[PDB]
Amino acid sequence: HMDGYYKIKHKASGKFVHPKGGSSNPPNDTNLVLHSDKHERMLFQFVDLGDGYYKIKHKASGKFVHPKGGSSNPPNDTNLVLHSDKHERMLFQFVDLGDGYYKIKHKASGKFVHPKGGSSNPPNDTNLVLHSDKHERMLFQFVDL
Ligand SMILES: CC(=O)N[C@@H]1[C@@H](O)[C@@H](O)[C@@H](CO)O[C@@H]1O
Ligand SMILES: CC(=O)N[C@@H]1[C@@H](O)[C@@H](O)[C@@H](CO)O[C@@H]1O
Ligand SMILES: CC(=O)N[C@@H]1[C@@H](O)[C@@H](O)[C@@H](CO)O[C@@H]1O
């Protein structure tokens, strides 16, 4: 129930969400990407604000998941980045399909987190984006540490 530290795992590929470059201290607007590796710089915390909306926090840096530019309605294929700012456009909802695999939905726009290109096997360092489509390659699993 979303307390503690988690790996965010892409169902189709098994890859994880990382800051690009994997650093403990990425600057603002660093891209989020998928990558196979596991380490403490790919852990996240979920901060429950109530009523099923969450801030997604990078453990190592304390920065949050944003759409690049922070719009209420980002276009399809808008990059997800880390940023220290907080506001309504960096909130997310987790929708369970019913077996513990989730769509990760941007509250403001209703778009979902996808690997860019939607592959079942994104290459390492593929950017994560927002997109309106739903399919099995935009499901994620939250793996507690
Ligand atoms: C050696 C090392 O930490 N490598 C990291 C890797 O684990 C992953 O975090 C990646 C994400 O872009 O960034 C680097 O290549
Ligand atoms: C929209 C705005 O006024 N500021 C935001 C900032 O808060 C953050 O969301 C960032 C993410 O790239 O995009 C803009 O710079
Ligand atoms: C046709 C096809 O592959 N569509 C996908 C789409 O569903 C979405 O996953 C997107 C994310 O960048 O990548 C592709 O455009």
Author numbering: -1 to 143
Question: What is the paper's account of this structure, in its own sentences?
Answer:
In 2012, a lectin designated “MytiLec” was isolated from the Mediterranean mussel Mytilus galloprovincialis, and found to bind sugar chains with α-D-galactose at the reducing end1. The polypeptide chain has three well-conserved repeats of a roughly 50-residue sequence, and adopts a β-trefoil fold. MytiLec-1 is unusual among natural β-trefoil lectins in that each sequence repeat forms a sugar-binding site, so that each polypeptide binds three identical ligands, whereas, in general, β-trefoil lectins bind only one ligand per protein subunit. Here we have adopted a similar procedure and applied it to MytiLec-1, to create a related protein with three identical subdomains, that retains sugar binding activity and the ability to bind selected cell types.
The sequence with the lowest energy score was termed “Mitsuba-1”. This 143 residue sequence includes 6 residues of the Threefoil linker, shows 61% identity with MytiLec-1, and retains the HxDxH and HPxGG motifs crucially involved in binding galactose. Analytical ultracentrifugation (AUC) shows that Mitsuba-1 is a monomer in solution, with no indication of larger species or aggregation, a result confirmed by size-exclusion column chromatography. The complex of Mitsuba-1 and NAcGal crystallised in space-group P21, and diffracted to 1.54 Å resolution. One complete monomer is found in the asymmetric unit, with no breaks in the the 2mFo-DFc electron density map of the chain, and there are no Ramachandran outliers. The structure is well ordered with each subdomain forming a β-sheet of four strands. Overlaying 143 Cα atoms of Mitsuba-1 and MytiLec-1 gives an RMSD value of 0.86 Å, showing the structures are highly related. The three-fold symmetry prevents internal residues of Mitsuba-1 from approaching the symmetry axis too closely, and a central cavity is found in the structure with a volume close to 100 Å3 according to KVFinder25. Three GalNAc ligands are found at shallow binding sites related by the three-fold symmetry of the protein. The contacts between Mitsuba-1 with GalNAc include five hydrogen bonds, including hydrogen bonds with two histidines and two aspartate residues. The HxDxH motif found at each binding site of MytiLec-1 is preserved, so that His 33, His 81 and His 129 of Mitsuba-1 form van der Waals contacts with the ligands but make no hydrogen bond with them.
